[PDB]
Amino acid sequence: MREIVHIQAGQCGNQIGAKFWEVISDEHGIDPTGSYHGDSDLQLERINVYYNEATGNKYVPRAILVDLEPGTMDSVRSGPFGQIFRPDNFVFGQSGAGNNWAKGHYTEGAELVDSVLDVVRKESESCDCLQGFQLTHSLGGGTGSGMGTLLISKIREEYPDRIMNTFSVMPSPKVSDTVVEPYNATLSVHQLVENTDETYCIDNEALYDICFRTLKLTTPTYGDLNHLVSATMSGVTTCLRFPGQLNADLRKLAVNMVPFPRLHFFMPGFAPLTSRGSQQYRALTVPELTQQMFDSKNMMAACDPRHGRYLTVAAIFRGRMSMKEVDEQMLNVQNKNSSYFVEWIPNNVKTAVCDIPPRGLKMSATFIGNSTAIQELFKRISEQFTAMFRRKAFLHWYTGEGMDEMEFTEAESNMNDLVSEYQQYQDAT
Amino acid sequence: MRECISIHVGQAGVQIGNACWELYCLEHGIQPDGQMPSDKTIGGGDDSFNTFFSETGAGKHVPRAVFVDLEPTVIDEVRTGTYRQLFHPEQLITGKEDAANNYARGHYTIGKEIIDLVLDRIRKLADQCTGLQGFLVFHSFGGGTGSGFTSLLMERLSVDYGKKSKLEFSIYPAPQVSTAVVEPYNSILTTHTTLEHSDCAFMVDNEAIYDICRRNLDIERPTYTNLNRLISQIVSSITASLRFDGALNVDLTEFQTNLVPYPRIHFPLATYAPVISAEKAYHEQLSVAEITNACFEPANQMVKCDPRHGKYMACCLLYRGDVVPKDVNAAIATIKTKRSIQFVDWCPTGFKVGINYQPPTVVPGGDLAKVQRAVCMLSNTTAIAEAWARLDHKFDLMYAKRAFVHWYVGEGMEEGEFSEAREDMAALEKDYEEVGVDSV
Amino acid sequence: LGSNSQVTVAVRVRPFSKREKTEKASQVVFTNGEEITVEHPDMKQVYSFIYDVSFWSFDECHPGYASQTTVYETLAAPLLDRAFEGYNTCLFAYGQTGSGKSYTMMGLNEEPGIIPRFCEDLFAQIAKKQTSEVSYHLEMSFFEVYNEKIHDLLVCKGENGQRKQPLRAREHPVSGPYVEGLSMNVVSSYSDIQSWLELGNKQRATAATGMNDKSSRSHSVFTLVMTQTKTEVVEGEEHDHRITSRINLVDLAGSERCSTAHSSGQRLKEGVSINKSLLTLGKVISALSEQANGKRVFIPYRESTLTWLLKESLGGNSKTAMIATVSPAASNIEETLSTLRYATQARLIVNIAKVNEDMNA
């Protein structure tokens, strides 16, 4: 069957992974110790999309962590859902990259990528078939960006015909999660545009605004941001793990959302989000979801879609529902806001449906969107890059660890060319 | 013992097949367990007819259906549902590597690993035949399996068998509604490949059936169960004369004749008029003069193409129930005297007829009503060209920037093939234009 | 950003093949002079195409028989002349498997193409200018693309079951893209150039297919960097002026319909890899043709490595020739039409070739 191989490169990847496991398990019924404790049968049928069997109806996860520092691994081990992992998949080191891509792609990562790829081989060759990988990393660092990009490169050199989907976090515009962001982000985009099949863009400010505006949370921890991110990671694979009327694997979304290869950077979204008090006043029907999904607030990409045009959009629903409603609603959404879509893609929407909904919502959904509004996110990075490269503000720490000055100009040119590729269609022809 | 072989390819095919075999089972009394309490109850009988079903010494009647697919999310609902003790376990699921909604994967790369098994199964279901009559594919344009696997299968079956009917059902893509943004490519390609090998292709369109279910049965929130039940009633109406006693019986070789004039123009449209709930089951007489005049209404077709934008070219009307052959002739006559229904000057007849005595069944907890008589009309008309042109225009808007072509190329497809399919499908539009110019 | 220029295009028909004679194939191509015409066998429609140059090799007896010693003096000689004038030059092929695009450039041992004649005219024309005022220097390179991976052709592999060193590309800020680890060897006499080309032809990947028994399943590029140091008016030491030039000769591969030319395994994979490379270059030509019409258009070179290492040749600073090899077969009719279509779409490209000299004084 189809089998996803998870990887967690860095602190953000590890936290999102833990929350996602703590999301998929309560969906399939697995407990922290590894045993099955459920009510239905459709859970154990397609459990091999993420899990493996050990001995006694125990179910261990197919997660492969990596982190140059030792703290996050111990945090994930001593946590609630830590006794279920495979301890030999913990592949860490010491002396972290130090917010330096150079110290996470050439010098330190070169010593441990071999071990991580050994675990990847061991876990993949066990599988009957293979549908792709699923990484989680955060631009703005050296472990995540560097190590994950190197791993994507080596996998796509080894296993090319599969999907190296990754739910990358991008840096926020206003606040700076780290000082030297544009170098690492531009280099990661240089090493991702040409070595991927799909990719998702998450931003922290959009999630803060989602937490403050819809969910009405005044003190959101990182766990809430992550709990708002594992949702769509479930929604993507809901049509593999569960049955439905209209199925859609990752490859179907890839064929239908990436018209040209480089333009695979997307905007995710969840549908039914509301406060613990304003849930008894809202109607849990389909058009409320469809207008809560296309709004410029739910999108985690920190880029308003109204400033561009949706090249493609994809909607994975989960619930007992009527397909007439979904199809007619997408048609009228295309007809109303026609200027925010294209004309040379006649139908610019993909639908997909499951039948086994989430743990407590009778009707859930998930949204993906390729729009030209994401060129702003890279325009910003390139402007910062020029401002900090025109007189070499922080560059000497990258050269000393084995790099040169030409890779930077290469990454800048590629990012700008991609911005131009999106801007060619941002303008009505 | 004359036999027809059903083949179902994809999610839509399997769902229509489930809805079809539910209807067959509730008709003959043959049950999910394969056992029929009709031969061993009164003292004899042939109720489970061996044209679509089979027989085993233990009373188990295994049907004649492969239910092909390349994703186990669908067939496992059969294998772990109600109708698991009925079919043959050789359902030919792959379990691996869905086509991802391209034609090149389900014709070159993943299809070739699976087609030989399906052909062997068809041969094994056709060697115990003392002379079959034809095949029936249930494929869906707007996919990888329905577009590519059907092409490969009708290409291989035009080599081994050859002189046998290879009819098909097809979910025609709606012009506005669609659940895929890569469907026109596959549609034109399949119409390039499933043209010189097939005989007739009955088309349907989910939008028109949504509209009629809204307008007549008063459902505002329909799902594909109710759609597939209508299509199941249609495929029962077109497969009853072999399966039941009648007066003016139609065989499967008679669709190729009275409906496919030219060897390429074989894209007709189905219609089933008495779609009325139990509430409207009363207040209506439901005679032939009402039915046959409803089947020709533009707002009761199954494709979203207005018949008034073109001339009718052929029609096959197949009835069920208490039909006395004078209301049928009178209905055809008063339909001929109308100025809207416009025929061409080389087919004045255009009114094939078929009658049968067994009324239609009804599924419990369903949507339709118990009507003593039913009708199913299949029309070959010249309006379809417009719809084709729409898809063709889409092909010209998306191919002119080489969109999505790497995906089809990555599975070995050769862009020249796309241009060839385009030029082939344009000549068919020119043919639909030729068959409207009246004789000099 | 100097002088304007236009892309040269030339067409070449091959004679019948064995597979075509066995199948009783007709002649669906004819010349009305300098033009080209195609008649579909069913007699439903005609097409005509006009180019700057046309050739003919259907039979040795017709008039206007353009042979190997003719296509050179019609197409390649201007490239060498403009190279001596300073400009850069490219000549690249296009066509279908079996069309004759590794016969017009490389040739046979008794029917040389452009490559074994270009670098001979070079030396026949340099001997007339071997005086002490202009001193020449020539470096060569010969590289290959296979399964979207770069490889070097003139390198002695170590003894092992698999030794084909993968290499990488890199973008230079000023000049343009280029290859790393490139064996930019030196050449002084034809006796070395012929030997290097022999080693290359041996190392280039080959296999048998239905449409060609000796099919080349890789994209080959042959680069010559020429530099002439010259003396001019100066206040001190002489020999300070320098004129540089690059000469690229590019042999591409064919679409290779995987059904007719039946094959499975590695051959199918490199054929689809070859297909993707051919699929981006048509997009690039369609995007560069729309530059002259006045529309804003993106020119994607990065979707394939061949276009990535040939940005300077399509656009950039290089006078470029396109040799389109076609077939007269009636079965291979749509692919020939596609080749001619891309040719007439490639004529409209306008590039800016500038004399490139660094005084260094």
Ligand SMILES: CC(=O)O[C@H]1C(=O)[C@@]2(C)[C@H]([C@H](OC(=O)c3ccccc3)[C@]3(O)C[C@H](OC(=O)[C@H](O)[C@@H](NC(=O)c4ccccc4)c4ccccc4)C(C)=C1C3(C)C)[C@]1(OC(C)=O)CO[C@@H]1C[C@@H]2O
């Ligand atoms: C009656 C009812 O509606 O209870 C809801 C509820 O009130 C709300 C607040 C739930 C609640 O969601 C949150 O509290 C929340 C907090 C921060 C960030 C994001 C969410 C809920 O926690 C979420 C939870 O839903 C789930 O459990 C889903 O399965 C969700 N599960 C988890 O993520 C999860 C994580 C850790 C442990 C257990 C479950 C999920 C979503 C997608 C895919 C898989 C699982 C349920 C029923 C509710 C509560 C509990 C209040 C909502 O959940 C989601 C993911 O949308 C928020 O909006 C929906 C519906 C309601 O607004």
Ligand SMILES: Nc1nc2c(ncn2[C@@H]2O[C@H](COP(=O)(O)OP(=O)(O)OP(=O)(O)O)[C@@H](O)[C@H]2O)c(=O)[nH]1
């Ligand atoms: N009538 C009807 N049509 C359906 C049904 N389910 C899906 N479809 C149609 O199927 C099309 C896309 O799915 P398919 O073409 O069937 O895809 P497939 O044949 O399952 O092949 P895959 O790509 O592997 O999914 C859509 O355009 C739908 O209109 C159904 O239950 N009934």
Ligand SMILES: Nc1nc2c(ncn2[C@@H]2O[C@H](COP(=O)(O)OP(=O)(O)O)[C@@H](O)[C@H]2O)c(=O)[nH]1
């Ligand atoms: N969105 C999100 N971001 C996080 C989370 N946890 C940490 N981060 C951010 O991730 C950024 C990068 O950290 P990281 O690259 O892992 O540090 P490293 O270990 O030195 O490589 C930090 O600046 C944090 O602010 C999380 O749960 N969600």
Ligand SMILES: Nc1ncnc2c1ncn2[C@@H]1O[C@H](COP(=O)(O)OP(=O)(O)O)[C@@H](O)[C@H]1O
């Ligand atoms: N002008 C020509 N005259 C005679 N034979 C030719 C001519 N052009 C090509 N051929 C024949 O065609 C073949 C060359 O095709 P080729 O270019 O090698 O295919 P590909 O480029 O697809 O590898 C050779 O076998 C050669 O004999």
Ligand SMILES: [Mg+2]
């Ligand atoms: Mg499917």
Ligand SMILES: [Mg+2]
């Ligand atoms: Mg060749």
